[PDB]
């Protein structure tokens, strides 16, 4: 294929040479007859003298050795100096390639090519499934979804991984291969557009490989942060935050923990009055004692306010936590000013209340906090608070690999510059490439143990049902963490032990065949096996 074009260029050079030697005049001395020695165009040369001509233009690496010259020695006989079998003999050391034609035996080359189609079709089938699932989520009824957003970004890293391998294999088939007797000799040389092209693809591959396990950590962290209770302590811990040191505020007081005022006059030493009473002697069990008492005092206040009591009674436990959130920030008299908004919540008119709450001056001051509280009244669940971590989840999936891969690209460019990076030095790929992946798996197993202990507590409580969406999503995430968390660790532990070779080529195609269908497995169990998407598929299809 690639050699067919070269053979056409060579035939063109041969035709072009035979015409250039035709027009020259016949020799009047006994000189080395002008000839095309299957490599270059040589004019008549006198005996006992070495000739030279510029490296032929048909070669792929023309511009790299165009300044260089090939040589051919003329002998005393009047005949050119020949090789061992009488073939033409020329010194083409200068015009030679920047690489080596690596031979591979008849059956061994047929084995590598046979296993090559298995991983080309494997990644193509996965890419086809990945892009099918991405089209279903990203252009249908789950458009502005919080759960499907994490899946789409997880598939996106696999699409790049599947894309990079298909490009690299497509650029590795641009090498020149020819059969030398039994062996198939493949040249290590690549074109200037292919050397740079596969180098970029190698960066995009390594960026994808790290991102896959980073977004696998996000999938694990999603269940851990979603499924944990969810309590008012986590709700206000996102809105205000935990703190051990006392800091000033808009009224001029000593604010500590999650929204607590210690002393009524501006002072530092007198703030230990109410702190020692709660402690009885600041940590996470000590500081939460101040927080728990605050929430109880907020509920006390809501029930002692005539305007706030009936609204608080009518609303459910999750919606109550949204009102306590407001009273925490504003106060009893401040939240009681929402006479029109509160009325709409007592009537159970959520979307009508969502418009009137945003129109008030509370949303004007702090829009980020109020938007999450308004959503809690709207849907009646903690949907807004699981999305607060999404910005941080985005920085851990795309930002975290760039902390390791972008500095590695610059290291491999100047230190060990190779054609298509897949070296076995164990210096750059272990600390720069494997470390961010091995640390993700380390944190994933620490999450996995926390997921099971959170599952057993929930499976015996009031939210114990098996047909729940949180139970369904766990069946996928608890499978992809141990399957991927073992596949890449078992491969890296035993890969420097074998030479090339006999047991290595069988071991490589064992793991690479699973790695090719890795993207298909992720797509199937998260999108295609998903019941919620299957219901909307039947809804969208049965309409016609």
């Amino acid at each position: 294929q690639v050699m067919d074009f070269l053979f056409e260029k060579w035939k063109l050079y041969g035709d072009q040479c035979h015409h250039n030697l035709s027009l020259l005049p016949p020799p009047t001395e006994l000189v080395c007859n002008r000839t095309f020695d299957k490599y270059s165009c040589w004019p008549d040369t006198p005996a006992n003298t070495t000739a030279n001509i510029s490296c032929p233009w048909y070669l792929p690496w023309h511009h790299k050795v165009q300044h260089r010259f090939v040589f051919k020695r003329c002998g005393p006989d009047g005949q050119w100096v020949r090789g061992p079998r009488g073939q033409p003999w020329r010194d083409a050391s200068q015009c030679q390639m920047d690489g080596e034609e690596i031979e591979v035996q008849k059956e061994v080359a047929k084995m590598y090519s046979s296993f090559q189609v298995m991983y080309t079709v494997g990644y193509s089938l996965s890419l086809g499934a990945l892009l099918l699932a991405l089209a279903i989520l990203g252009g249908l009824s789950k458009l502005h979804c919080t759960r499907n957003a994490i899946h789409a970004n997880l598939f996106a890293s696999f699409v790049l991984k599947a894309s990079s391998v298909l490009v690299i294999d497509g650029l590795l088939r641009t090498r020149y291969s020819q059969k030398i007797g039994d062996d198939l000799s493949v040249s290590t040389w690549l074109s200037d557009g292919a050397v740079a092209g596969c180098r970029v693809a190698a960066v995009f591959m390594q960026y994808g490989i790290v991102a896959n396990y980073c977004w696998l950590l996000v999938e694990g962290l999603y269940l851990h942060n979603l499924l944990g209770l969810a309590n008012i302590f986590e709700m206000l811990r996102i809105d205000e935050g935990l703190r051990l040191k006392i800091y000033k505020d808009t009224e001029g007081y000593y604010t500590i923990g999650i929204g607590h005022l210690l002393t009524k006059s501006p002072s530092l030493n007198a703030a230990k009055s109410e702190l020692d009473k709660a402690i009885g002697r600041i940590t996470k069990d000590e500081a939460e004692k101040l927080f728990n008492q605050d929430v109880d005092a907020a509920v006390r206040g809501i029930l002692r306010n005539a305007k706030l009591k009936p609204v608080y009674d009518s609303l459910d436990a999750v919606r109550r936590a949204a009102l306590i959130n407001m009273v925490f920030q504003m106060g009893e008299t401040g939240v009681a000013g929402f006479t029109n908004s509160l009325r709409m919540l007592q009537q159970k008119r959520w979307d009508e209340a969502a418009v009137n709450l945003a129109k008030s001056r509370w949303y004007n001051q702090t829009p980020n906090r109020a938007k999450r509280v308004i959503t809690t009244f709207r849907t009646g669940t903690w949907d807004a608070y699981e999305r607060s971590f999404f910005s941080l989840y985005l920085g851990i999936g795309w930002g975290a690999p760039m902390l390791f891969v972008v500095p590695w690209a610059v290291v491999k460019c100047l230190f060990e510059n190779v054609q298509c990076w897949t070296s076995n030095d164990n210096m750059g790929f272990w600390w720069i490439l494997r470390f961010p992946v091995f640390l993700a798996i380390l944190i994933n197993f620490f999450i996995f143990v926390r997921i099971v202990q959170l599952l057993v507590a929930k499976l015996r409580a009031r939210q114990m049902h098996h047909t729940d969406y949180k139970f369904r999503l766990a069946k996928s995430t608890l499978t992809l963490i141990p399957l991927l968390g073992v596949h890449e660790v078992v491969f890296a532990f035993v890969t420097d032990e074998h030479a090339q070779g006999t047991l290595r080529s069988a071991k490589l195609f064992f793991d690479l065949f699973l790695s090719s269908f890795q993207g298909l497995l992720v797509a199937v169990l998260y999108c295609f096996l998903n019941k919620e998407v299957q219901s909307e598929l039947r809804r969208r299809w049965h309409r016609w």
Partner: antibody
Amino acid sequence: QVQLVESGGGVVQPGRSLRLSCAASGFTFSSYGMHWVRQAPGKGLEWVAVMYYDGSNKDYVDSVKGRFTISRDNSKNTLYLQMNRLRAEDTAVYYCAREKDHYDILTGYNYYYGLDVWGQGTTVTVSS
Amino acid sequence: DIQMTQSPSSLSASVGDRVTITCRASQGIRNDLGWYQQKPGKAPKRLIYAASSLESGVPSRFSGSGSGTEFTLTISSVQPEDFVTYYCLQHNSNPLTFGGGTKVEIKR
């Protein structure tokens, strides 16, 4: 169907000439280099000439140099050997054989793979 | 010119024996060696090429080995048909040179 069938050899007189013929079938004659090999009645095998498609590359054994002349017609798929100034030492059975060669366009080196397919042998008796 | 010293000139072996013919090249000729078999009246047929590689359709008993200067043809278990002449052939440098020719005769 890959074969080579010699012909032409017979009884000749010393000094006179004789043109041996070797007719290829079953393969692309233009690809393969070709050889001539003789064997004396009581002695072992002796190489004598070679040629390639060019056919600027020809070679012979010191004893037959100038005397013997190898040639080919790729259209007729035939190898030849014009044997002039014949001597008693030439009395032999003459085999022809093909050699596959490969030229690496990238490096400019030739790789040779020996005499694979042989003929059956045409006897040449040179006597008065 | 490469003198192909073939040894022995005529070995005596009986059916079943392992026969070992050796050809020694005067210069370094790489793996460029071919072992041939000539039956009485028939043309010479190559059994081994590239010094060690076996020709397609040749009984597995025949085997080649060696490189450069020492080369060996080995018939693990001679059968009735194997009792004929064998030659080595160098194709590394012109002029091409054969061996003297080992004749495998049936011992008694």
